[PDB]
Write a protein that binds this DNA or RNA. Structure first.
Ligand SMILES: [Zn+2]
Lengths: 148, 1012, 184, 187, 117, 199
DNA sequence: GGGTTGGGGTTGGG
RNA sequence: CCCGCUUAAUUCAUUCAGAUCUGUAAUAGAACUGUCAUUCAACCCCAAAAAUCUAGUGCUGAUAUAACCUUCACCAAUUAGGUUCAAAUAAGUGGUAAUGCGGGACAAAAGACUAUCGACAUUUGAUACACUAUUUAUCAAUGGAUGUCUUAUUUU
């Protein structure tokens, strides 16, 4: 009953694989993981992917200790600039001598479509990793016990 | 030249606005961006939707939306998801049509209010449009463009983009305002003449007390130093001390005293009050008339006020000459009308700052910067002037007199001594108790209605031989958690009744409410009369006496309950309406915006949940248009509900438990509904329509049984009947009398005005006083029985015209105010009865002649008031009209442009778009010459205008005559080219032009139009 | 919005429709033939159907729906109702904007249906026509409810917490008593 | 030590609460979507003037003190405080809104924030305010949330107001999540 | 387009694995001053030092105070470095909550979501 | 009486005759000063022989109006007091401030020095500005305030910059300045001569 | 600790 | 017309409410006190018009059968007599104001002025200070300005 849920790369891959393997579900974009969800919360390190001849779509990468996913960043059409939250990442990456860092990213995912990335903030404290893991486990248990 | 057209398109109008650089329909934009091609095939309804939809943008963005070969267009998202993505893309911006009724929470959008425009956005046509566009372009198309979708023949509905109402949008000192409105309608009386006991004159009986009571004026920021405050405090101390030595009894006896027979009037009033039996009508009329002739003249009160001010205020507080100026302006203050007021600058601009001697400047600005010193001391002089009038003059007038206006005197102001008004109030209360008002006690009324509704007040307006009570429901009770007055409580039921009002027009009676309905009825009757062959006509006019007080509450509730025209449940919608004005389109200085062409109005409507034909649920509005010009509507997100049970409870309360107050005494109505409530007008019409359809069956089938034309209309309590048969008129009189006898009401003054004469003894009509007149007069309109043409009635003297005009002029916006005032004065009533279907060419010319003669007299006081200000001292006007003759140039400019606009509107009203342009030009020149001749003739005698301005006006009039003659001369050659074929109306216009010989002069036509 | 739905006074419409249904059923079956009365009493079949008049029209927000059992949940402010709908055609005729959930609808006509089950009479409410007018995604927390899919037990619940439900439950029990008196 | 509760518990307890009840909570959450559609500030006197007499030309006069006062602007903001579990609408008063503005822009002083906002709005600079308010989206904090069950215009309603705002530090939040998960696993 | 598993382990499980593609995290040690970078586990009350050979101590940013590495363990107290990130932490890193999280992730009930099978 | 009124009217006509009014012109100025050549009776009330013909002034005004009513030279209507004809019948110490910043306007410095409140004359040259008073005593009544005694410095504020002044110009220089004033007067006289001599 | 939208302007019919 | 000064005295009346006194058939007489008001006052329905008015004209060639001008209070409607793109002398009403006292020769085309003034006086500009219908200062340019006397007798 909650559209937002925190989960990692491995769960994203497992959910997509399960949805694709058995497509006998309702005719709606919503996924099915102990309910219907649209948004996701994940903390993982971010790195740009240099695609070819893809101006409107910018491909990113979110690798983690469990796996990896592919995300797409959209940009404005009336003019050719980047979103502020990713411009900050670009300038910080330039400043710190091209060192990749973990980010706290919120991403919207729908079936039969790519995974949009909406917003992230650079994290500098390693305590966020334990916080994210504990939050993931707690929310998974809450969802399972609320289904029953 | 530019002319008003009855037919226009939205695309043409939008191209005239400089802000929008790109205007086109959706189809041509789709082809321009290569989204679709002409070889592609589409549904006919989708094609129609693409053709009719109109879009616009502030810049050209065709290149940005060009089709890209990188990736095709396939849609997998729903329309809701795309719209949500667009709204999230909007972000913090707060004024967009798609944003109405919703809020954004991060990356989530919440729908919370009813928006009736969402049905268009979430329709199948927009789904197909999304399929054509694609998500990445649809999300930005909804933002960068203004989308108008056609829902009616001429109406459009904006569903996307910035709202249209957003286009319709270092400080300077502002002087205080004289509180002249306080003087009116004071009922309180005291034992000793003077001021109220709460005034600072009576509270004092040192400097401490006066400082405490006058804190608002002692600690003003306009005082430079503490020395000025001390001097002002000493002056106020002297003022207070002097006031207690004024013998008010002697002053009232000397200037404005009671009649010599006051004791006789008091004794008569006391005897009438004490007598148990009903008082005589003639004696009471004589007593009321004698009481009303004790009014005090303006000169008497001006002398009284001057005497009070001279011996109460020191001569050196304002200056030797400023005091005299103030005293002279006091008279002009006294004689102003009801809605007229003075300004502080009317005193300041005629005073000398340096006359005041006790003013002290902390810094020597008297010689270095004289202008700053003058400004600073003017700021104090204005405060002093406001203090004198508001504290002394206004309370004395409010305490010692009752100031009000009469019934047929318009806005003229009358003063009555307080004991006289106490006698009048006693007599009026005696008269009210016998018929419709009874004293009440709060024990009877239940606490629910006591704590739910606020109460009203009673006011008395003098009439010749009687009174006219008015009940006002403005108050709201601070206690019992009431924040609205009774009308605001009954606002929604008024919307429901207004919905009921439309069906009353034709279904269940003969009721009319506005001029358009009356004009349509007259046009239909005139067409039938012309078809019949113009036979003789007979008319009867009669009216109901006290219609509001003659209503039976039980019958009204029974009619309300058993009527099927009022539904159980209603929903309320709010929307904004943009409608074309009467301004022609300029043909392409650079700043042209929407307000130049459109008028913005806020509207509300009540609709039912049934599957009605009007289908308001799909659109959200219901507008009636008299032309083909476009209009735009945008919906709002504030819905409400109202049930028939709530209206029934409101009606039951107002009928049964109406309570009003008068001099701290409560009363209650015994019969009828109160006038002064927003729902009484429709209820009266409904109630009387029921009876009149009960007793007028013979009229329904008479149009076919014996073939006789007849028309019956009733506006409120006034009846008008025009027929072809005298027997029909007699039968109508008899039937209406029977209905009045059976239903307990009666006709005013037992008078009836007809066109014929009949023996009244046969029909038991002996008590009626039949008056025979050959020319019908109804609701201020004069109707001829031979040619059947209608024109309004105008007053004949300047004094009668002046009584209904209030003059308010501000220097900031002289031009706009004066031009709009002239426009309203010409277009007030002439715009509704200038129909070519009612009057002929000569009739229209005569109507214009008389109306313009009235309007010039109406506007004359504004021109005299303008000359009291010299514009050579204002840069804003002197830079444009020079310094030598600024006022004359300003007035000439205003008059010329107003007359031109009025002539254009008249030509738009008279002719159709199919008529040849030369005829329209000739008639416009004729109307302009008529109005300019009237203006020049009226103004040629005045002394203020005698010199420079009349020459310019005469030149304008001569130029109009020459242009009219030239157009008439060239029309013959233009028509002789045979390139044009003339229809019936054009031939009629040519016949009118040639018969009056407009080629040479006007002396043939003047006798026919000037006849009175 | 919540004030808009409260001003509707749906309970009055329900009371009027129930009174009309009871009166019409009493009037139409005055023959009182014992063999016919015994024949009409069998398990699991409807005995009467009274369509509401045109004046009993209201609007509510859809909170949930169930296609397997044709059970639809409606809420307005304080009270939430659990009713049925005739078939999927009712949902298809109403042009929903996005989804049936969180949508404001107008019920054009509904009807009371009488069923005899388990030696007692059950009265249901069935929706026949619906019209969608807007989307309202706003959760309303209804303290109290009444169920039309469980008989007397589904309606009498939460009667002590509201006077209107108490009155409607009393009327419902009176109707059931009259029905079982006349038929049995 | 304090007690921390999630948004869902606050929502469930607020609904069940009778009219006239108040209670306070502590939540770990992020502020989002400050709303600017309504008026952004109001005027009050220094002596707690209940009634402020409106005049023309920026003239004012308090009634609780009876002196010519310079008008004082108080800043009020409505936003949404959302945790992972749920979202609620809240009202932010002068002190907390000034603190947030100072945090997002250190140049503006605390009590000067309302004056800065008023000057930007009246002078015709709304883009700067929009950009300033947009940078506060998804900013984590520690909130003290109070709900009141009160009746306005004879209509029952629940209003959420924020009392305190503190900077976020992940450590005790991580400890609290760990202990809640341990309690859930134990039972 | 590639699935690589980098499970998290503690100091005592390091000997239990004896060569697997894993990830470990710890505070950077500076008192020993080896040529190769040395990181430390725990609150430093108990000595647990591991060294990585691929990555040099001096090349990384001076402001860096905390790091986590992803690579296969070469030997007891030696881990190869494949991917290294830098954390500039102004606050102490809590190791008890991290240990509890690792132990709960290794539990049978919650291991399904963390790792395959 | 009637004869007295007739004699008074004859005397008034003689005094208002066109021939007599030209040589004397004593009442001609009153006629010119009238609003619309309608003089009142107050002018004739100061007469000697006219008053002696009398043998409550409204009664005298009415008598004069009756006497002049039948006449045609004068005019009388509405029983007013005024009268009119039926024809036109027309026909030591001075100081200098120093160290003025270059480019300073004259208006600024003259405004700065005029704050004292007494009239003077100023001329601005490169820096130096001569100022002269009209009477001796204003110098000593002004030097008590223009001298800031708190700082005891001959300082005046001009354009937001501190300027210096000397309390006494050299005696030879004041003689030269007086000679300059005399030269300016002489040059005005010579210019006046030239203006006279262009014709 | 907040809170329909208060006006502005004033002619002509009833 | 402008300017200076002055312009008068005892109650015409006393609602509503409270509280005294005296008389006696409900009538009345005498005296006293408090006092706008739910802190507001402000009738309603229908209909007409609506520029951010430095923005707008075929700026006007016309019909001596016409257009203007003249009247001892002002102002506005009612009659005669003249003149020709602008000019001077008239005859009956309605309505509104009307204290006393003192003053009202520069009319002017000029002359003698070497009395007066870079501190005289305009004229157009500029620069400051002001602007809701300000009564100014300085600068630049420039030429006239102020005052007295002469073409003059209170039957004025
Ligand atoms: Zn205060």
């Amino acid at each position: 009953p909650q559209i937002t849920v925190p989960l990692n790369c491995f769960m994203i891959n497992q959910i997509v694989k399960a949805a694709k393997e058995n497509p006998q579900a309702h005719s709606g974009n919503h996924y099915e993981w102990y309910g219907a969800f649209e948004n996701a919360i994940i903390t993982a390190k971010f790195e740009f992917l240099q695609s070819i001849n893809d101006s409107p779509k910018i491909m990113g990468k979110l690798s983690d200790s469990t796996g990896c996913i592919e995300v797409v960043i959209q940009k404005s059409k009336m003019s050719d600039e980047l979103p502020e939250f990713v411009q900050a990442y670009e300038i910080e990456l330039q400043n710190n001598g091209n060192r990749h860092k973990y980010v706290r990213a919120m991403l919207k995912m729908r079936k039969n479509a790519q995974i949009q990335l909406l917003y992230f903030s650079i994290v500098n404290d390693a305590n966020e990793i334990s916080r994210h893991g504990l939050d993931l486990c707690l929310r998974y248990l809450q969802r399972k016990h609320g289904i029953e | 030249k530019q002319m008003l057209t009855r037919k226009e398109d939205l695309l043409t109008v939008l191209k005239q606005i400089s802000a929008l650089k790109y205007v086109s329909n959706l189809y041509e934009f789709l082809l321009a961006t290569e989204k679709i091609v002409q070889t592609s095939e589409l549904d006919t309804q989708f094609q129609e939707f693409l053709t009719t939809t109109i879009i616009a943008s502030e810049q050209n963005l065709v290149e940005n939306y060009k089709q890209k070969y990188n990736q095709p267009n396939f849609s997998q998202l729903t329309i809701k998801q795309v719209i949500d993505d667009s709204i999230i893309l909007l972000g913090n911006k707060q004024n967009y049509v798609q944003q109405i009724g919703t809020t954004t929470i991060g990356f989530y959008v919440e729908y919370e209010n009813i928006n009736l425009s969402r049905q268009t956005l979430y329709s199948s046509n927009f789904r197909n449009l999304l399929n054509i566009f694609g998500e990445e372009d649809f999300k930005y198309f909804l933002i960068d463009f203004l989308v108008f979708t056609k829902v009616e023949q001429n109406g459009y509905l904006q569903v996307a983009g910035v709202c249209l109402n957003q286009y319709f949008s270092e400080n300077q000192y502002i002087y205080p305002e004289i509180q002249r409105s306080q003087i009116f309608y004071c009922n309180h009386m005291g034992r000793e003449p003077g001021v109220f006991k709460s005034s600072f004159f009576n509270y004092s009986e040192p400097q401490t007390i006066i400082k405490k009571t006058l804190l608002k004026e002692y600690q003003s920021k306009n005082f430079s130093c503490q020395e000025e405050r001390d001097l002002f405090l000493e002056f106020t101390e002297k003022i207070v001390q002097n006031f207690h030595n004024i013998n008010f009894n002697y002053l009232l006896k000397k200037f404005c005293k009671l009649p010599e027979n006051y004791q006789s009037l008091k004794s008569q009033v006391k005897q009438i009050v004490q007598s148990e039996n009903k008082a005589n009508q003639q004696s009471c009329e004589n007593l009321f008339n004698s009481l009303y002739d004790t009014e005090i003249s303006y000169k008497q009160i001006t002398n009284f006020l001057r005497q009070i001010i001279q011996n109460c205020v020191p001569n050196q507080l304002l200056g030797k000459k400023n005091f005299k100026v103030f005293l002279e302006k006091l008279y002009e203050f006294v004689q102003m009308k009801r809605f007229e007021n003075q300004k502080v600058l009317d005193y300041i601009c005629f005073m000398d700052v340096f006359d005041v001697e006790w003013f002290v400047d902390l810094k020597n600005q008297k010689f270095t910067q004289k202008r700053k010193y003058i400004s600073d001391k003017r700021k104090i002089l204005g405060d002093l002037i406001v203090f004198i009038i508001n504290k002394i003059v206004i309370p004395v007038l409010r305490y010692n007199f009752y100031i009000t206006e009469k019934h047929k005197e318009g806005s003229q102001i009358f003063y009555y001594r307080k004991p006289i008004w106490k006698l009048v109030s006693k007599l009026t209360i005696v008269k009210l108790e016998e018929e419709n008002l009874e004293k009440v006690e709060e024990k009877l009324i239940p606490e629910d209605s006591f704590q739910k509704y606020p109460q009203g007040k009673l006011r008395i307006i003098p009439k010749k031989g009687s009174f006219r009570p008015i009940m006002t429901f403005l108050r709201k009770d601070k206690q019992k958690n009431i924040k609205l007055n009774l009308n605001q409580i009954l606002m929604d039921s008024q919307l429901v009744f207004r919905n009921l009002k439309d069906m009353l027009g034709q279904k269940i009676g003969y009721s009319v409410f506005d001029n358009k309905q009356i004009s349509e009825k007259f046009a239909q009757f005139i067409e039938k009369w012309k078809n019949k062959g113009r036979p003789q006509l007979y008319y009867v006019t009669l009216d109901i006496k006290k219609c509001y007080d003659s209503i039976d509450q039980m019958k009204l509730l029974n009619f309300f309950n058993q009527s099927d025209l009022i539904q159980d449940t209603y929903f309320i919608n709010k929307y904004l309406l943009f409608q074309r004005n009467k301004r022609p389109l300029l043909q392409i200085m650079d700043n042209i915006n929407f307000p130049y062409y459109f008028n913005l109005k806020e509207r509300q409507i009540a609709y039912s949940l049934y599957d009605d034909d009007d289908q308001i649920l799909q659109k959200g509005f219901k507008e009636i248009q008299s032309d083909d010009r476009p209009f735009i509507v945008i919906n709002q997100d504030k819905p409400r509900c109202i049930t028939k049970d709530i209206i029934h409870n409101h009606l039951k309360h107002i009928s049964q438990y109406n309570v009003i107050s008068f001099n701290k005494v409560k009363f209650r109505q015994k019969r009828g509904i109160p006038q002064g409530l927003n729902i009484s007008g429709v209820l009266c019409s409904f109630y009387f329509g029921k009876l009149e359809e009960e007793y007028t069956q013979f009229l329904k089938n008479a149009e076919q049984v014996n073939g006789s034309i007849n028309l019956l209309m009733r506006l409120t309590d006034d009846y008008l009947f025009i027929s072809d048969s005298q027997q029909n008129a007699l039968n109508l009189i008899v039937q209406l009398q029977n209905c009045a006898n059976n239903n307990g009401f009666m006709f005013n003054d037992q008078k009836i005005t007809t066109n014929f004469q009949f023996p009244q003894e046969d029909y038991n009509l002996e008590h009626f006083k039949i008056s025979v007149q050959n020319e019908c007069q109804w609701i201020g309109k004069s109707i001829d029985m031979n040619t059947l043409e209608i024109k309004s009635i105008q007053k004949q003297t300047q004094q009668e015209i002046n009584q209904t005009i209030n003059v308010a002029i501000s220097i900031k916006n002289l031009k706009s105010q004066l031009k709009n005032k002239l426009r309203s004065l010409f277009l007030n009533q002439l715009i509704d009865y200038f129909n070519p279907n009612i009057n002929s060419f000569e009739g229209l010319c005569r109507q214009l002649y008389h109306h313009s003669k009235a309007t010039v007299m109406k506007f004359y006081p504004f021109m005299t008031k303008l000359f009291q200000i010299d514009l050579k001292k204002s840069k804003q006007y002197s830079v444009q009209y020079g310094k030598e003759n600024t006022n004359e140039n300003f007035l000439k400019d205003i008059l010329y442009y107003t007359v031109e606009d009025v002539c254009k509107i008249l030509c738009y009203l008279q002719f159709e778009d199919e008529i040849n342009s030369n005829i329209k030009e000739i008639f416009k020149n004729l109307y302009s010459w008529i109005m300019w001749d009237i203006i020049v003739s009226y103004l040629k005698k005045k002394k203020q205008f005698k010199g420079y301005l009349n020459k310019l006006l005469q030149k304008i009039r001569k130029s109009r005559f020459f242009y009219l003659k030239e157009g008439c001369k060239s029309l013959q050659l233009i028509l002789s080219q045979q390139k044009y074929q003339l229809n019936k109306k054009e031939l009629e216009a040519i016949e009118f032009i040639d018969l009056n010989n407009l080629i040479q002069d006007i002396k043939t036509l003047i006798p026919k139009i000037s006849a009175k | 919005m919540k004030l808009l739905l409260q001003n509707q006074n749906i309970f009055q419409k329900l009371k009027n429709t129930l009174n009309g249904c009871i009166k019409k059923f009493y009037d139409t079956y005055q023959d009182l033939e014992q063999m016919q009365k015994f024949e009409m009493i069998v398990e699991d079949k409807l005995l009467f159907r009274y369509s509401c008049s045109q004046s009993e029209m209201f609007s509510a927000q859809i909170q949930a729906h169930y296609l397997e059992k044709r059970v639809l949940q409606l809420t307005d402010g304080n009270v939430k109702y659990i009713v049925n709908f005739r078939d999927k055609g009712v949902l298809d005729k109403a042009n929903f904007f996005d989804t049936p959930n969180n949508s404001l609808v107008i019920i054009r006509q509904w009807s009371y249906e009488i069923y005899y089950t388990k030696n007692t009479f059950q009265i249901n409410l069935v929706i026949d026509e619906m019209r969608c007018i807007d989307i309202i995604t706003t959760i309303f927390y209804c303290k109290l409810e009444l169920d039309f899919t469980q008989g007397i037990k589904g309606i009498s619940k939460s009667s002590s917490f509201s006077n209107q439900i108490y009155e409607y439950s009393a009327q419902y029990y009176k109707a059931i008593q009259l029905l079982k008196k006349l038929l049995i | 030590q304090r007690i921390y509760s999630s948004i869902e518990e606050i929502i469930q307890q607020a609904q069940a609460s009778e009219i006239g009840q108040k209670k306070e909570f502590y939540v770990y959450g992020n502020l989002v979507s400050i709303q600017m559609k309504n008026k952004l500030y109001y005027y009050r006197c220094t002596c707690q003037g209940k009634s402020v007499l409106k005049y023309h030309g920026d003239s004012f006069f308090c009634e609780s003190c009876q002196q010519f006062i310079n008008p004082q602007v108080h800043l009020m903001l409505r936003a949404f405080v959302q945790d992972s579990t749920g979202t609620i609408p809240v009202m932010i008063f002068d002190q907390q809104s000034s603190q947030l503005i100072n945090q997002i822009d250190p140049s503006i002083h605390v009590q000067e924030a309302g004056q800065y906002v008023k000057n930007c709005i009246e002078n015709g600079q709304e883009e700067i305010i929009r950009q300033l308010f947009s940078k506060l989206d998804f900013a984590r904090f520690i909130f003290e949330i109070q709900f009141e069950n009160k009746e306005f215009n004879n209509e029952q309603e629940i209003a959420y107001k924020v009392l305190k705002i503190e900077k976020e530090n992940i450590k005790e939040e991580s400890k609290y999540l760990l202990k809640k998960l341990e309690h859930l696993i134990n039972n | 387009q590639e699935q690589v598993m980098y499970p998290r382990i503690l100091f005592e499980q390091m000997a239990q694995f004896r060569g697997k593609k894993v990830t470990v995290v710890g505070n950077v040690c500076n008192e020993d001053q080896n040529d190769s970078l040395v990181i430390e586990f725990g609150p430093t009350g108990l000595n647990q030092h591991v060294v990585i050979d691929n990555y040099r101590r001096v090349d990384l940013n001076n402001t860096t105070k905390f790091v986590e590495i992803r690579g296969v363990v070469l030997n007891q107290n030696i881990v190869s470095c494949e991917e290294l990130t830098e954390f500039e932490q102004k606050d102490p890193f809590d190791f008890d909550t991290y240990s509890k999280l690792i132990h709960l992730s290794q539990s049978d009930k919650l291991s399904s979501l963390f790792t395959d099978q | 009486e009637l004869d007295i009124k007739e004699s008074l009217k004859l005397q008034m006509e003689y005094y208002f005759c066109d021939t007599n009014l030209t040589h004397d012109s004593y009442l001609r100025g009153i006629i010119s000063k009238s609003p619309k050549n309608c003089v009142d009776i107050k002018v004739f009330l100061k007469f000697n022989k006219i008053q002696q013909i009398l043998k409550s002034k409204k009664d005298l005004i009415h008598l004069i109006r009756d006497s002049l009513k039948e006449s045609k030279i004068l005019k009388v209507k509405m029983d007013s007091l005024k009268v009119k004809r039926r024809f036109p019948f027309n026909l030591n110490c001075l100081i200098k401030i120093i160290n003025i910043p270059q480019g300073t306007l004259k208006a600024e410095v003259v405004l700065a020095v005029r704050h004292l409140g007494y009239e003077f004359y100023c001329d601005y040259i490169d820096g130096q500005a001569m100022i002269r008073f009209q009477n001796s005593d204003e110098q000593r009544l002004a030097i008590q305030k223009l001298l800031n005694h708190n700082n005891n410095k001959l300082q005046i504020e001009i354009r937001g910059q501190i300027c210096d002044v000397i309390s006494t110009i050299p005696e030879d220089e004041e003689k030269n300045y007086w000679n300059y004033i005399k030269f300016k007067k002489n040059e005005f006289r010579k210019f006046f001569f030239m203006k006279k001599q262009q014709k």
